[PDB]
Structures are given as C-alpha cells and as structure tokens.
C-alpha cells in the first residue's frame, strides 16, 4: 500500500497507509523518491528513517515502499565498477548528470543494464536437476579472470526448460526458464541478495590454505591463511596504504573486495586516484587491478546507514564472488568510523548505550561481521571450493585499547598485527611491532604447510625465541652495557641487527623485494639459521669473535644479496652460499 | 492460532485479540515468507499481549503473519537418547541425524533444589591438575567457575580439564559430562569439537552448540536446555553429571542487549538488575540431592573483559557461584604451562575433601603452607623488584626461589599430561623441602617430620 | 666526594625505581578507577535522564 | 497569515491548520504588538506544525499572532558580485551596505562531492605566519584545524591570516580574479567583531572578501545556519565561478553550543556531557565542504577554529575535529603569557598534507628538512632546558648548549612574528637558515648533504 507521511521530525518521517510495508524495509519518500529506511511500524502508520536530507519532503506526497529490505545485485557488470555506501557508481553519476556534486534523491543502478554481455551455458542443459548456487552458465566480465559464472539464484530448485544461452544479452534479461514445484519461473544471469544476509553455501570448513602476502615479515611472523582474519592499526601517515595495496596486489586470492567506512577527503581521493594505477603481474599484464576487484568508497559526508552497513554489503559482494568458487578478500579501512556511525545509529534508534557510547548490538554485529568470512564450499551442483579473507583496520579516537572497538577487533580477529609510528620513523620498512605481534592460527597453518614440507614454524619459533633473547639483551644493554656481555650475547645482537636489515626489511619499490616467494622466505630463514648455527658452532670451537667477524664478512655480504637477483628458479644458488657458510666454519677452524 | 498483529518495533512483537497468555509460553510464529520462528511470551495486559522474537522482526509483514499459541510454558524434548548426539542452540540436531524421540517434555528453566532436600558437597575427584588438587580442591557435585582472559589458552585448559577429568577420576563407573556453548567463535567451536573428539567422551556426553552467527535468544536458551538435560541426567537417569559451559560473556552482553532493547531499567555497568538472580538461576541449580544417587558438578568458563578482574562480569560470577579458578595473563605470557593464579583462585569448601578418611590429613596444612610461602614469595618479589636483590633478607630470596620453582614445576605440567593426586602431593612435599624449617608456620611438627626426607 | 656521589647515585636510582613501578602504577590505577566511576555515574545520570 | 497557532513553548511554537508543509520551511511570524519576527519550521505533522521563532515568542500573543507560510526552505543568493558585501545570519544587512544582486539562488543544504570526482591536494597554500606556513605546511584541499583557548587572541590571528591570504600567491607566476576569503562569526563579543570589521576595512581585503557576523545576542539558529551559508557561498565560487576560495570559521565551540540548543529544540535526549550523538555527522557535513575538484581549476580550502573548554583537549569538539581533519594547530598558554607573538606549539603542530605543500615547484626543497630540523632543535632544546634546570648550566654539553641557544633564539626570533606582520616563505626559509647558522655543519642530522651544499653560503 502506498504510504503518506503524517509526521516529519528531523531526518525521521512517519507515514500512514504503510501497513503493506514491513520493518527494516527500504522506501522512497516524497515525490522526489528520496532513499529511506523503515524503522518501526505502528498499525497502518510506519515510522521510517530517511538517510538523506528531509528538506523538500512535504505532506500529500505519496511514499512508495520497496516491499523488501536492503539488498545488492550480484552477477555480471559488478566488477570494474566503483560504488558508494548506497552501492551507486560515482563515475557514472559524473558522466550522466555531468555535475561535481550528487543531488539528494538521485538514484542509479549498481550494475549496468545498458551493457550487453555474451553469455553461454557451461555445465547446464535442459532436464538436469539443479539448485541454488549451481552454475547455469558462464559470461565473460573482466579482462583478467575467467568468465564469471552465472549461477541459479537462491531459493530456486527445479528442472530447466527454456535456456536463452548461448547468446548476447544484458543484465535485465532472463537467460533461463526454470520449472519448480511452483510451476513456471524465470531466472536471469543477474541475481539479488540481501545485504544483511550472508551468501548461502553448501558446507562450512576450516581454512588450511595459506594466503600469500608477498611481504617477508607478513608471511613469516603473522601469516594470514586464505579465509583467515587479521587486524591492524588505522593510524594515518604510518604508511598503511602501501601495506594494504601491496597485500592486495601480491594476494593469492582471485578477487579483492575493498569496502570503506569513512575518512578525510584527501585520503579517499588519494586512494581512489592510486587504485586504477595498479597493474597485474600474473599473465604478464592483463587489465588494471580495478578490473578484477571491487571498490566501495564512502566519505565522512556519507550517511551513517551507508557506513555501518557498508561492511555488510562489501562482505555480501565478497561472498557473492566466493559463491562462484573463487578465493577473495575483504578489506576494511577505518572501521572505527563505522563504529561511531553505529553509535549515532544507536542514538537514532533510541537504544540505551552500553559503555563509552557504544551500542547494545556492538559485539553481536562485530561477531556477525567476523563470522561471514572463512573458507568453505558453496551451494549447488558445481560444488566449487571458495574462501573469503577478512582484513580490518581500527583507528580509535583516543588510541587506547580500552575502547570497545579495539577490544572487539582484538577479540574477533584471531590475528592482530600492530602498526607503530616509531617503527616507521626508524627509517625502516613497513612498521610492525615484534613484541605485540601474535597469532592463534600458527598451529593449523604449520600443520598444513608441513604437507609440502615448507615449514616456517620451526625457524619462526626459533627466530621468535632469538628475538626474545635479543630483547632481553637489549634491556641489559640499556642497563649495564653492551661491552660487558659474552660472545653468545654479542652474536645474538649482531644476528638481531642483521635480521632487521636484510631479512625483515623488504622494499616494495624494488622488483625482487616487492614480493617474497614462500621458497624465498624459507631459504632466507634457512640461510639465517645456518649462519647462526655456524656462528654458535664456531663459538664453541675456540674461534675468536673478531677473527670470525672479519673472515665471515664475505658470507654476510653474500647472504645480504639473497633478497635480490629476481626469480627463485635457481634457489639452489643460495644453498651453495650456505655451504660456503659451513666453509666459513672451516675458516674458523683454521685461524 | 491468531493471525492478528498490531505493532512492530525493533526486535520485538505485539499481538491483540488474545487472552489468558502464559509467561514464557511457547509460541510459533509463521511469517509472510513462510518462515517459522519459535518465540516466547514476554508480558500480557488485558486483551493485548507482547512477546519477543528470537529470529528477529526483520522482513515480516504485519497483516500477512499468523501466530499459533500453545499456551504451555517453555518446553524442551528431553530424553535418554541425547547421549552421543549433538544438538544446536535451537534444540535442532547439529549431528545431521534423524528426528530425536523425546522421553519427557520438561521446562528448560529448571527447578531450584529445596534447602532441606539439598545435600552438601562430599567425596572428591581427580582433575589431573596439582592446582586443582593441592591449592584449591574440587569436590564432586560442587560448583566452581573458571575466570580466564581473551587470547589466553582458556579453550586449551578447558580441553585438558575435560580430557583428564574421567581419566584421573578413576584412580580415586566413568564420569559423564556435558558440553555447552553460547554465541562462541567457529574456530573455538572447531577446537572444542576436536577436543571432545580427542577425549572420546563425545559418545558418553551431550553437546549444545549455539553459534555466534545464530540469534542471542537461542544462545541464552541453550544454557536452559543444557540445565534441564543435566538435571534429567542427575535425577531421572541417576548418573554423575558434569557441566561444562563456555562463552558466558557473550550471553551476558546479549542479555544486556535484550535488557536495553526493551528500555528496561539497567543495573551496574549497563547490565540488568536481575542479572545476579539470572545467573543464580543456573548457579544454584548445582548440588547434591539427598536420597538420590549422583550429583551435578558445575564447572563454568568465563572470560573477563580486557583482562580486568575488577569487571562486573567476574564480580557477579563470584557473587553467584561459590569459588572460582582465576587465570592471569601475567603468567600466560611467560611461556609456561597454563597460568593459574593461586592467590585469586580459590574453592568454596576445600575442607570437605581434606582430612583423614578421604585422602590424607597432610593435605590442607600443606595447602595453607604452600599458599603462605607463595604469597610471601610474591610480596618478596615485589620488594626485590622495588629496592633491589641485595636489600632483601634470606627468607625473601628463599620464598622467591620457592615460588619460582612452584611456577616452573608444580604449576607447569602439560595439557595432555594428567598428574595424579599422589604425584601432586609428592611434588608439593618436594616443593616444601626447598623452603627452610622455620619458613612455614602453617605446618604441624608431625607433618613436617613426615614429609621432610 | 666520589663515594658520596656513589651514595647519591644510589639514592637517585632508588628514586627512579620508586617512580617506575610504584608511583606510576598507583597513579595509573587510580586514574583508571576514577575514570570508570565517573563514566559509570555519568551513564547512570544519562539513563535517569533518558527515563 | 495564520492565527490558528495552537500553543507556544519557549522559542518554538506549534500551529494547527496546515496543508502540505515541508521541512525547514521559512515562515513570517507577526506578533500581537505588530512586531515582525522571522521563523523556521522545525518539524511538521498531519495535524499541526512546529516552528521556531529566532526572535522568540516572547511578547507574542498566539490569539493576535499571524503566521505566513513562504512555501520554501532555507536558500542563499549566490552571485559573482557577492564579494565586498557584509551580511547577517538571516542573510540580511550587517555593515549597512547595499543589497547584493543574486546571479543564481541555491539550497542551503547543498550537495556532497563525489568520491571519483575528488582531487588530491596539489597547489601549496601560504598561511603567512612564521610558525604556521613553515612548521606544518598547508595545501589546497587540506583540512587544518585551529585549536584556541580561553583568553587566546584567536580573532587577531584570524585577521592576520586573512590579511596574509590575499598576498599568499603573488609568487605563483587565477591572478586576474582575486581569491575569495570568507569570514564567519558565531557567538562573538562586540569588541572582537568591531575590531574584526575595522581590521577588515583597514586591510582593504574587505572588498575582495565576504563577511557574515552572528553575535552572541543573536539567536543560536542564526549562528548555526551561518556556517551553511558560508559553505554554500564558497561552493558557488568553486564549482560554478571556478575560483580559489578560502573559508575561516571562528568560535566553533559557540556553534557547538548553538547546535546543542538546536538539538535540544527537538527535546531529544542529549549524549555524553550534554552533546548530540549526531554531532560527528554535523561536523562531517561541514569540514567535507573543502577539497579539490577534478577538472576544476578553482579550489576551496577551509581552516576552522575552535576554543578548547577549560583549557582541555579532552573536549568532544577537539576529539571530533581530530580524527576528521588532518593535523591540528594548538596554542601554548605559557608562550601567550610570556608576552610574545602567536603561541603555536611546534611540538603539537602538525599537518598530514604538509608533504604536498612543500618541495621544488611548490615552496622550496629546503622547506621540510629545515622544518624537521627546527622542530628537533626546539624539542631537544626543551629537553636541554629541563636538564639545565636540574643540574645547572655547568653540565651543559655541546649539542645541549647548541640546542639551548637555538631554542632561545627560535623562541625570541623565529616564533615571534607579529599581529600585522606577514613574512614570505622565502623570508621564512632565510630566517630559518640564519637562525640555524648558530649551530655547526655537523649539528644537523636531519639535513641532507646536497641540500646543505646548495643552501649554506
């Protein structure tokens, strides 16, 4: 039933004859059809909350209800398209309206219906039993990834009758006719799924598949498996954007879903400008990085409803791409903005705050957002495997860990990597605190990595204990002195300084130091462990520290070059150097 | 079945044209999309009624929805076939098995044990841990909680306890436990599942699993179903019932959320005012029944927010349950085996399992002496860290080394390693030998002469 | 004078140790408890006002 | 004219018999004594409608009162000739100048800038102050907050900045059209406003700029709506007129109390310390009006100013502008009580976009390095000042004494500029090098060899 507003209070508008509409349902208010959301419902008069400006909306103006909740369009035409918190293209808005500003009440489609695509039935014929999630065909979207699989939409089970494949059609055209228990039904290449409801899958599983960060320290210290969850600081000027971009580019995942909450205009503009500049490095060079990825940007001026629920939409899209059986990743920048927007939404909902101005559903929403990720098997006949790697950033107001956002982030995410501004001010590579770094996923990742016998965990724990001993030695150096220590302590300190230079530090600006392969990092840790073991063996052999440090300098200079020389196809070249280190030991057994 | 509904606000529901509604009555809600959601009645006034929706009011039409009222209160399908089978938070089977046949339909709220009919905790048990034996004893049928912190090996400690429980107990009929989770993590769920699988007790135990993805109402109702199950096991089945509950913090925050959503008058820290009694509902349900064999031993597990022992959660937990086992993050970063703080951790009655006729009369005095030496060692550690190592007396350094050895040896054993009570008492006797003769004033001459080699 | 300087250095080190884990921890804990009490009181007042 | 008004409580009143009313609609309220009081609709319902009289309902009998419905919301008279005229919170005359002829009318609500249409900071922006344009650099499209305090002459600083803004780009080699400056007053004293207008007319920048003055005696709605008016004015000279614009807001705390009263007008339950929970969005609807547009030569920059209550940075306002805006300019009460020029602490002073506002082609290659070196000299000089106050000046070391002399000099020379004093970036760098000349060549570890070789002479 068409609604008519009988009351307007601030952003909130209550409309009678709304009995047909439901709770938490989107609606178009006024003659301008402004975007709004129904909060409560009393009899035939529902109380709705307009996310846009309430100016211009008057009495007597018919209010049309969508009849459903907030959703999004998953399918072809979604990729290589920038979107807002309301899931609308900015570039198409600037192309059509030809304005630098976005008018209130304006609306545009997320996926282009004016774009013709060539679709073809892959593994679906007429008479075969299929269900929701089962691929009914394949249509090429981006220029990088293989043709995007068009699958039978959820809550649809039956036998196919008339297939419109193969052929050229838009996203607004039905590509199939399915016969269910409800008799005749229509199905298209594009589908619509709720933003508050995660994408349906067949079975849930645990993720043993490690995701490649490309960074040495990231893959070694705090490795994040594909499907796993990791968190970090949202401090500006700490060079977080470089780490994020490098992580997105060197990721082993098929696609990347970036969902922003809110930030300064300069930062958002910088990210938007630097986004399309990235190029692929798989098949030499495909299209831009924006083609095989999705971007959702919301500034500070954006609505709170388009902020807190933006992560839901982004995760919905990421899971939608994961519903096609492809590993993806969800990046969230400045989640504290979404938390504050959730606080303002809590104040707008009249819900009594819990602590420090946080809402009641805070922990529930956080856990709900954290449980959407992971590696699993999607629904349908296809039975394709997929994953979603969650990555979030927290930028608290006061910076204290006592804040609800920080506690919830640390609690939900099993992996927390701190970003220290001083570490970035140390004239070093990407800033991470070695002391505060911890992960609970180490066990499964180690057990899984042992299958290929690529074992970081031994050298990881060894270098960890070495880092602890070096930390104690550093505490003792600031207490008594650095010249009062023993030979083992000095060797440990030198190894600590060496590991923080040619190992931990990796320049993203260079070619071979940009992305460190698993074999590269493993060989690096192996060579380092070999050097430390050779030094420890030479220390007990009766060799002087000075003579050893003088004689083994060539080994250190050769080991320092193991971060370069490109491609690891000849990784054995490093092993020889390790043998040379053993010769260095033989050089310590002579002089 | 009434198809009439009036208003809708937030996560709640209000209906009219009904009468004689029952408090917390089972009600079936059929939505416009055909979705069937279970719900309980909140309050009833005149010809109008108000109830709370478990699955949420999201996506529900007002005039297109129908509601069927059973009129009976909250009812659960308890049976003797629940053993070995896993159940979800909504009561539905999580083991993907067929329809479970209910032996009896009973209220999940649980019935408080009568004071005269209530029997005091007695006998003893072997948890396989020295701290769970010497420092703080654990009676069979008694109720003690476990206070841990986020990031700590709480799941590992709980797994070790559950695994070594029935194994060590036999050295004192196998012990039967119950696993219950409310709004927990999927990773912790997998860890707990692998733990129950490794322990092999899953066949002799029942599991109630409420995911965090699931609603808060189901998670809160999981504890009730587990309570009714354990009660039916410790009464009708006449067997020993161990109660293992996890993620109480999530249920607490969810309870505060439900309290705030109804705009009810909040208590301390924004929580509910009935929270104390709400916890005391399942807290005082534990105990022994006179004339009835078997007992229900409550071993809850909770996590203090931001590792704060001053948090309202731990305070209310201690105000409800009698005694608790505290886990400090200070010893958790030491790399040593699981971080139990002897000072904060204590048992309600440690004198029930002590004395002659049970195990030995040298238990309690050695516990008091060890606690005294440990506390003195802690104070001496603070003083040594303050003034210096040369500013402390001999007894200070002695108690310091004794406490350090107690932490490195006695406190650190292993997860898969279950230490016998005899081994614990022996290790304690060897630990007291480290201290001087005049060091322990809490020990008697006979025990001092007997224990000293 | 060097011996007296050593004693004074010892007193200074003791004062530094007293300004490290003693005064700082006490002030921090007190500030935390006071902040908690003030925030709780403000929350109660805001709850009463909302009521 | 509507006599159907049901009742009046405080500044807000309710009126029955309304048809097709809108939100934030303008209305003319004629009082019983014949007094003319303007008003704006706060809310509307199916039965009655609630509005708010800026002059108040005091002395207005609802029986003899009349209410004329305009049928339109708050709008602004944008024009290219708008520069040089002074207005008020309601858009009415202030300095008793003429009536500005509008080129086009626009909405006060305005519209947000598209994310893909946003352009990053490129051109540098000269502040003109020795402690501002040097330490933390500012560029077009950057949000730089100004933190003042009680008893702090933020007015004179604002006037000095406005005076230094006109000559800020003589060196740019956009010249024909003078850059537009926007002066906005909210809840300001009579003396401060008088001095502001006097200095504006004396500097001669009053003709090339625009002034909107809302005093404390004026209604809160006027001061609250003043910001939107100035924002729309700056937006009209950017997206349409395509010209460089600069926005300046004074006493944002008074506007915060005004917005608090406006929020209390809806009888809504206040948040922590009596402040709206939507205030974050309110500031997000303000500071987001600054930035660079892609394809547009004209850029708009905004530099708001707010006084911290009870000399505390813990205030909700500062915390709100902190994570939103990039960098913040604080004020040291000690240096202000030291009888010196503007007391901006170099330690607290920072800018995130300062990296794009310096360098070759922007300002100088010696800018950032000498800035960090000067800041380090002030900090280490402060530490050495604390150390010298302990064991005395006899324990002063080489670098310690050097940092002491450098700190004293920078405090008595570099930091001190003047009220009407405006120094060029070249003069600032020259003074910086001259002040750093007191230290040796090896005394600066923050300087590069090439720069030092191409500078020192």
Distinctive features:
part of a larger assembly; 4 chains; B: 453 residues; alpha/beta; 7-stranded mixed β-sheet; 11 helices; C: 51 residues; mainly alpha; vacuole (chain A)
Would you spell out the secondary-structure blueprint of this structure?
This is part of a larger assembly, with 1 copy of chain A (591 residues), 2 copies of chain B and 1 copy of chain C (51 residues).
Chain A: E1 3-9, E2 12-16, E3 26-29, E4 34-42, E5 45-50, E6 62-65, E7 71-74, E8 82-83, H1 90-96, E9 117-120, E10 129-130, E11 135-139, E12 148-151, E13 158-163, E14 167-169, E15 176-180, E16 183-187, E17 191-194, E18 201-204, H2 216-220, E19 229-233, H3 240-249, E20 255-260, H4 265-274, E21 293-296, H5 305-308, H6 310-322, E22 327-333, H7 335-349, H8 362-370, E23 374-378, E24 385-394, H9 404-412, E25 415-416, H10 421-424, E26 438-439, H11 442-449, H12 457-477, H13 487-503, H14 518-539, H15 545-551, H16 553-559, H17 572-588
Helix pairs in contact in A: 8-9, 12-13, 13-14, 14-17
Chain B: E1 7-8, E2 13-15, E3 25-30, E4 36-45, E5 48-53, E6 66-73, E7 76-78, E8 86-88, E9 104-106, E10 118-119, H1 131-135, E11 146-149, H2 154-168, E12 176-184, H3 186-199, E13 206-211, H4 216-235, E14 241-246, H5 248-261, H6 275-283, E15 287-289, E16 295-300, E17 302-304, H7 312-320, E18 323-326, E19 346-347, H8 363-386, H9 394-410, H10 421-432, H11 445-451
Parallel strand pairs in B: 8-13, 11-17, 11-18, 12-13, 12-14, 14-16
Antiparallel strand pairs in B: 2-5, 3-4, 3-6, 4-5, 7-9, 10-15, 15-16, 18-19
Helix pairs in contact in B: 2-3, 6-7, 8-9, 8-10, 9-10
Chain C: H1 2-18, H2 23-50
Family (chain B): Belongs to the ATPase alpha/beta chains family.
Binding site for ATP (chain B): 348
Keywords (chain B): ATP-binding, Hydrogen ion transport, Ion transport, Isopeptide bond, Membrane, Nucleotide-binding, Phosphoprotein, Transport, Ubl conjugation, Vacuole
Structure description:
The structure is cut from a larger assembly and holds 1 copy of chain A (591 residues), 2 copies of chain B and 1 copy of chain C (51 residues). Chain A is of the alpha+beta class. Chain A has 17 helices and 26 strands. In chain A, the strands form 5 sheets. In chain A, strands 8, 18, 19, 20, 21, 22, 23, 24, 25 and 26 form a 10-stranded mixed beta sheet that branches. Chain A has a 6-stranded antiparallel beta barrel with strand order 1-2-5-4-3-6. The longest helix of chain C has 28 residues. Chain C has 2 helices and no strands. Chain C is rod-shaped, with a radius of gyration of 21 Å. At the A-D interface, strand 1, helix 1, helix 4 and helix 7 of A face strand 4, strand 10, helix 5, strand 17 and helix 6 of D. It is classed as hydrolase. The entry lists the keywords Hydrolase, Autoinhibition.
């Amino acid at each position: 039933e068409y609604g008519a507003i009988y009351s307007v209070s601030g952003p909130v508008v209550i409309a009678e004859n709304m009995i047909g509409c439901a709770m938490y349902e989107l609606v178009k208010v006024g003659h301008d059809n402004l975007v709004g959301e129904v909060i409560r419902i009393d009899g035939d008069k529902a109380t709705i909350q307009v996310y846009e400006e309430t100016a211009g909306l008057t009495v007597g103006d018919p209010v049309l209800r969508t009849g459903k909740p907030l959703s999004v369009e998953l399918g072809p035409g979604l990729m290589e398209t920038i979107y807002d918190g309301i899931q609308r293209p900015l570039k198409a808005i600037k192309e059509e309206s030809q304005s630098i500003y976005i008018p209130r009440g304006i609306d545009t489609p997320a996926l282009d219906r004016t774009i013709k695509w060539q679709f073809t039935p892959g593994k679906f014929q007429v008479g075969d039993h299929i269900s929701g999630g089962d691929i009914y065909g394949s249509v090429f979207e981006n220029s990088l990834i293989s043709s995007h699989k068009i699958l039978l939409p959820p809550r649809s089970r039956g036998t196919i009758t008339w297939i419109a494949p193969a052929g050229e059609y838009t996203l607004d055209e039905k590509i199939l006719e399915v016969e269910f228990d409800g008799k005749k039904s229509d199905f298209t290449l594009y589908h619509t799924w709720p933003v508050r409801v995660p994408r349906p899958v067949t079975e849930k599983l645990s993720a043993d598949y490690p995701l490649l960060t490309g960074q040495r320290v990231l893959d070694a210290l705090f490795p994040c498996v594909q499907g796993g969850t990791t968190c970090i600081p949202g401090a500006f000027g700490c060079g977080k954007t470089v780490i994020s971009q490098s992580l997105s580019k060197y990721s082993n995942s098929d696609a990347i879903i970036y969902v922003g909450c809110g930030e300064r205009g300069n930062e958002m503009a910088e990210v938007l400008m630097e986004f399309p500049e990235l190029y692929t490095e798989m098949s030499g060079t495909k299209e831009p990085i924006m083609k095989r990825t999705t971007l959702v940007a919301n500034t500070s001026n954006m609505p709170v409803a388009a902020r807190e629920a933006s992560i839901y939409t982004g995760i919905t899209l990421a899971e939608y791409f994961r519903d096609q059986g492809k590993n993806v990743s969800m990046i969230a920048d400045s989640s504290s903005r979404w938390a504050e927007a959730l606080r303002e939404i809590s104040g707008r909902l009249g819900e009594m705050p819990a602590d420090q101005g946080f809402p009641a559903y805070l922990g529930a929403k956080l856990a709900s957002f954290y449980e959407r990720a992971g590696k699993a098997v999607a629904l349908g006949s296809p039975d394709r495997t997929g994953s979603v790697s969650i990555v979030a950033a927290v930028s608290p107001a006061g910076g204290d860990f006592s804040d609800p956002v920080t506690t919830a982030t640390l609690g939900i995410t099993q992996v927390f990597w701190g970003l220290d501004k001083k570490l970035a001010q140390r004239k070093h590579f990407p800033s991470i605190n070695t002391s505060v770094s911890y992960s609970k996923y180490t066990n499964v990742l180690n057990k899984f990595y042992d299958s290929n016998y690529p074992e970081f965990p031994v050298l990881r724990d060894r270098m960890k204990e070495i880092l602890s001993n070096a930390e104690e030695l550093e505490q003792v150096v600031q207490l008594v002195g650095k010249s009062a220590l023993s030979d083992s302590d000095k060797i440990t300190l030198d190894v600590a300084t060496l590991i923080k230079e040619d190992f931990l530090q990796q320049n993203g600006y260079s070619t071979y130091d940009a992305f460190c392969p698993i074999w590269k990092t493993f060989d690096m840790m192996r060579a380092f462990i070999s050097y430390h073991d050779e030094a420890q063996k030479a220390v007990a052999n009766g060799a002087n520290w000075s003579k050893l440090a003088d004689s083994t300098g060539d080994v250190k200079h050769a080991v320092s070059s193991s971060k370069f020389f490109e491609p690891s196809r000849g990784e054995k070249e490093v092993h020889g150097e390790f043998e040379k280190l053993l010769s260095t030991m033989q050089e310590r057994f002579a002089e | 079945n009434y198809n009439t509904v009036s208003g809708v606000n937030g996560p709640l529901v209000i209906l009219e044209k009904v009468k004689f509604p029952r408090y917390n009555e089972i009600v079936n809600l059929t939505l416009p999309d055909g979705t069937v959601r279970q719900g309980q009645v909140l309050e009833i006034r005149g010809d109008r009624a108000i109830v709370q929706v478990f699955e949420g009011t999201s996506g529900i039409d007002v005039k297109k929805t129908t509601v069927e009222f059973t009129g009976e209160s909250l009812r659960i399908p308890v049976s003797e076939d629940m053993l070995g089978r896993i159940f979800d938070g909504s009561g539905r089977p999580i083991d993907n098995g067929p329809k479970v046949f209910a032996e009896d339909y009973l209220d999940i709220n649980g019935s408080p044990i009568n004071p005269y009919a209530r029997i005091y905790p007695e006998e003893m048990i072997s948890t396989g841990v020295s701290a769970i034996d010497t420092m703080n004893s654990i009676a069979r049928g008694q109720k003690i909680p476990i206070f841990s912190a986020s990031g700590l090996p709480h799941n590992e400690i709980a797994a070790q306890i559950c695994r070594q429980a029935g194994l060590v107990r036999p050295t004192k009929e196998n012990f039967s436990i119950v696993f219950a989770a409310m709004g927990v993590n999927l990773e912790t769920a997998r860890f707990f599942k692998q733990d129950f699988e490794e322990n092999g007790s899953l066949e002799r135990t029942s599991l109630f699993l409420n995911l965090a993805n699931d609603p808060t109402i189901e998670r809160i109702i999981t504890p009730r179903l587990a309570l009714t199950t354990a009660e039916y096991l410790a009464y009708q089945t006449e067997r020993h019932v161990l109660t293992i509950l996890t993620d109480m913090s999530s249920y607490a925050d969810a309870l505060r959320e439900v309290s705030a959503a109804r705009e009810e008058v909040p208590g301390r820290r924004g929580y509910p005012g009935y929270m104390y009694t709400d916890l005391s509902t399942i807290y005082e349900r534990a105990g022994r029944v006179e004339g009835r064999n078997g007992s229900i031993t409550q071993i809850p597990i909770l996590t203090m927010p931001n590792d704060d022992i001053t948090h309202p959660i731990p305070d209310l937990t201690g105000y409800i349950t009698e005694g608790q086992i505290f886990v400090d993050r200070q010893l958790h970063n030491k790399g040593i085996y699981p971080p139990i703080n002897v000072l904060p951790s204590l048992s309600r009655l440690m004198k029930s399992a002590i004395g002659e006729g049970m195990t030995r009369k040298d238990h309690g005095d050695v516990s008091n002496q060890l606690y005294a030496k440990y506390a003195i060692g802690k104070d001496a550690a603070a003083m040594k860290a303050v003034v210096g190592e040369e500013a402390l007396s001999i007894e200070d350094k002695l108690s310091l080394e004794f406490l350090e050895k107690f932490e490195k040896t006695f406190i650190t054993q292993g997860a898969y390693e279950d230490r016998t009570v005899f081994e614990s008492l022996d290790q304690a006797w060897s630990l007291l030998r480290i201290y001087p003769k005049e060091m322990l004033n809490r020990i008697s001459p006979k025990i001092l002469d007997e224990f000293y080699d | 004078a060097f011996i007296i300087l050593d004693e004074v250095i010892k007193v200074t080190n003791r004062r530094v140790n007293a300004i490290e884990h003693v005064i700082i921890p006490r002030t921090e804990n007190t500030i935390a408890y006071i902040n908690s009490e003030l925030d709780e009181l403000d929350r109660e007042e805001f709850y009463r006002l909302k009521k």
